């Protein structure tokens, strides 16, 4: 468990490790926006 003072952010921490995956997906939103040029 995190230290008590940071217990508030526990649900945030459970989600953080997936964030690098979102960067790969963001590349395809960007390319969709400019039309895969």
């Amino acid at each position: 468990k995190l230290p008590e003072a940071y217990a508030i952010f526990d649900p945030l921490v459970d989600v953080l490790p997936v964030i690098p995956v979102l960067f790969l997906a963001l590349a395809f939103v960007w390319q969709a926006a400019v039309g895969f040029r």
Partner: peptide, 27 residues
């Protein structure tokens, strides 16, 4: 819940693209 965070973090990405596409930015 935990889905509140990942919603806020999830929307952030497409939000940057949208703001730049509406402001006609360097996309």
């Amino acid at each position: 819940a935990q889905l509140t965070m990942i919603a806020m973090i999830g929307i952030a990405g497409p939000m940057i693209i949208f703001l730049l596409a509406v402001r006609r930015g360097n996309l």
